[PDB]
């Protein structure tokens, strides 16, 4: 940077190191980006996006030569506003000056904390949506399958529940690979060491869920979500990825802000099952 | 492309991206291509293919010097017509114009759905054939071995059934690697967590089936197929692989079609065993 | 493209002239430029600030030209009939005026006669003399008490506009001439309004405006059965920034 | 500043037009030039029927608005004109405050206003619903102002209610009361929302009676970036000097 | 203590920064000594063979 920040105390190298630190810190904590595709970086010229919702699908046809009429499914159009997520940190002038005079790398540790907080907030927004902007989430979308779990302290109940959820998803002509996301309590219960047998239910469960089983602290209690992945079912629109801005010198110190603009689009709500108590 | 589509709104880059999207979407869903070879891209000059069926085989000979007479097995010749499988989608003009003016990547999401549907249809055709074109499938070919499965809720029955099927296949002088394909119900039953023991039958079963065990939603109920792989037993003839065509502007929008032309040739039906209830 | 450039030019002129002669709202509402095709939604800040997003809709109507008549036209060297184009262009303008004066319930866009935060005035019996002047004066006073002192525009239903054509008692002048100086931006009538209703609006680009993406335009739908279909379309929307600058004369 | 020269010019033009179309007191009151920023206080000599010198301190009036970086970024990308809308609201608020200060003064700086100065004439109005009463009241007020060697062009400012009540037909006459009233008051009849109820003021205009001292006119200043946003402030410094309190007649209920 | 992030269409104006306690630490030194004998080193030098580093 430093082209739009002439008064920034740092130079281009420090800005590059700061960006690298922020990106690396955000990569580890982003659970939602491991199974959801990205719709590229759009830019500053977009402030709203359009989402299309489908209810039905049409199969292909087998013929020696093509027909003449084309069948295209209908959809409902909705408008979404891209929110902004941000967090601020501060660099003190004495330490920065000492590092400059001693020619040693600058210590970026508040930036990591800010990036972690922003990533946690983004995951929360993905899994629950924004109430004020009226954007649905995975656990509260309309037109989704629901299942009631049993007692997971016993052996085999979790496998039965996962099988039933997968069957419910298959009834709606969804055959793609599935991904499972669980709260920490259920994830711990899956790995529990039983007394009557010597089974590890995670090994049995991972046979069917071929896109991985993840755990997230965002979910509370005993809840989980099973999702048929694929960019044709749901995705993420990113107007601007993780970035840092110089707020402006105050009190001889230097504050910075980490911000991002993303939104989640769900196109086929029928491909989502939620396991609840 | 764009050489044969002068009026296409897209340019060469968008066509390349569309082809990449279609190919990548089709690759994941094509279960049948993981153990069946391809007889190359033939071309537009072929509209029918020939298939040869054998019943018997001749062993080799051991001699210090070669003999004078050559023994060649006989076969039955059949003619097959290459079908066409297709599905249509649509791109709206407002979104395309906005993407063009904003210089952002175009959103291809209906193409993924069309490719998934076409792949599902192709798998269905491979596993069941075409009735109107009179082309047999794996589960209904003539001159194949059949086996009746027992109760797979218990432990060890699946292993016994697989062993018996492999023995039946071995009786016909077939020793090559074997591949197993199962319906979702049987596949789930294989990974079931038992109560009396702590066994995982999939590990035992994969010892013998060295070409992998696959599951497919095309099969219904409790059915499965065991196949001795190898290009000398069965293959696929592809006149033209996955491709997209511009149907022509209508209603100021732009419709496209995804199409392919493939056929399945089975040469030695004795190398197929079907497990049925 | 069955027609050459001259026929397209006459088609465009015919559509533009037919549309312009019918539009009412464009006579006293400013346009927010031809933004272009790169925008699909707009933002409105109601200063009372509250920000809302409006999706720009599309208005269109289609017609058809036959090939026998066209071929006879070039054979005989006679002007080409374009009645269908004018008939199509009239309906688009009518729909645009209806949307401006009442809004769209499906796109959730308020209109001039149903926006929230406006002023409401109950009119009396206009069959007498002087009641209309008193009602207009009271409405202007209601507008003036809200720090709004600027040019005013009055739009009335045809029935009320006709009722205004009388003699003002004790002065022997037509009341319309007594209103035209209070309402300095002109008095208009439109068939869109029904019954005894009217609106008084303080004009100005800071109070309300019209945002357009594509103006009235014609597109060729491609040949079909050797005929030639065409479409007439435009994309407009109305933004109301100060709801307090509107007084509706209701009944 | 994010804006280039053109945007600054447009902002200045918008503020100037909004202030000009909203100011009432400036229509019939002279200006004592743009003095400059080298003066912070003024001297006023009141003639009571002699001269009493009083020092007035020039106050400062201001209001702040903000531009959001997302909007300018989108406008730059799409190449569309910027929306200067908050500036209009700020200018309107500043003009309203200035008019209120002119018509009532500031208690903090103890500067008298038009409706509360000492040494003026007061007239009690009657019921203006009946036709002809307002004409009589205006005539009587001008008569009261006349027996003070004051005969210059008069100006009348009324509350919106009284202004609206004047638009009826004069009894036993063809014309409306507006024309008859404007015949006597040759400097126009104005209305402002600052006055409340049934109140009005009649003033004998002229530079030697009252005027306005302006040290700095309407102007805009950039407060510096904050939170990636951009705040601006509109401000001006004016004061009102009343030299002859006897040239004012206030109509009160 | 820690502060969470915020969700808004446009950024706010006030910034919240957590407080901390400052302490000073002195960097210690950790060391250990070993020895190389001269006879072995001279023999390795004359024979042109790698020196044996095992005490290190």
């Amino acid at each position: 940077k430093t082209q739009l920040f002439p008064d920034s105390p740092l130079t281009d190298q420090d800005f590059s190191q700061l960006d690298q630190t922020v990106i690396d810190t955000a990569r580890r904590q982003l659970i939602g980006r491991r199974f959801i595709e990205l719709y590229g970086p759009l830019g500053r010229g977009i402030q709203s996006i359009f989402n299309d919702v489908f209810i039905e699908n049409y199969e292909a046809k087998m013929d020696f030569q093509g027909s003449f009429d084309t069948d295209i499914e209908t959809s409902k159009r909705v408008n979404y506003t891209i929110p902004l997520l941000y967090k601020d940190f501060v660099l003190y002038w004495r330490d920065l000056e000492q590092a400059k005079v001693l020619d040693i790398p600058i210590d970026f540790s508040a930036a990591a904390n800010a990036a972690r907080d922003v990533a946690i907030l983004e995951d929360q927004m993905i899994f629950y949506g924004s109430k004020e902007f009226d954007i649905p989430g995975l656990m509260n979308v309309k037109g989704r399958s629901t299942h009631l779990i049993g007692n997971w302290y016993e052996s085999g109940n979790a496998f039965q529940d996962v099988v039933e959820a997968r069957n419910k998803l298959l009834e709606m002509k969804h055959n793609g690979p599935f991904a499972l996301v669980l709260s920490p309590e259920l994830y711990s219960l899956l790995h529990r060491v039983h007394k009557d047998t010597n089974v590890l239910e995670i090994e049995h469960v991972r046979e069917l869920v071929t896109d991985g089983v993840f755990q997230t602290p965002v979910l509370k209690g005993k809840t989980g979500v099973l999702v048929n992945t694929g960019r044709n079912n749901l995705d993420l629109a990113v107007s601007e990825d993780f970035d840092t801005a110089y707020l402006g010198e105050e009190g001889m110190n230097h504050p910075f802000r980490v911000y991002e603009t993303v939104v989640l689009r769900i196109k086929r709500p029928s491909a989502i099952c939620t396991l609840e108590d």
Side-chain angles (χ1 to χ4, degrees), chain A residues 176-201:
Chain A
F178 308 109
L180 186 54
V181 184
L182 290 154
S183 78
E185 158 139 30
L186 288 192
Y187 196 86
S188 99
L189 266 187
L190 211 68
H191 289 86
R192 206 185 70 103
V193 165
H194 285 274
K195 64 288 187 194
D196 40 295
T197 71
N198 195 2
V199 302
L200 222 71
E201 298 237 23

Side-chain angles (χ1 to χ4, degrees), chain A residues 28-47:
Chain A
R28 179 217 146 161
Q29 293 279 341
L30 275 182
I31 187 83
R33 287 204 191 180
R34 311 216 172 119
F35 64 98
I36 299 181
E37 280 228 343
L38 285 193
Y39 182 30
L42 296 180
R44 308 286 246 283
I46 269 65
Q47 271 189 28

Side-chain angles (χ1 to χ4, degrees), chain A residues 10-29:
Chain A
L10 319 167
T11 180
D12 35 22
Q13 316 309 310
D14 326 305
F15 257 124
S16 322
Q17 294 177 22
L18 184 47
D19 287 333
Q20 264 324 293
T21 302
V22 168
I23 281 156
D24 298 8
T25 317
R27 182 170 37 230
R28 179 217 146 161
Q29 293 279 341

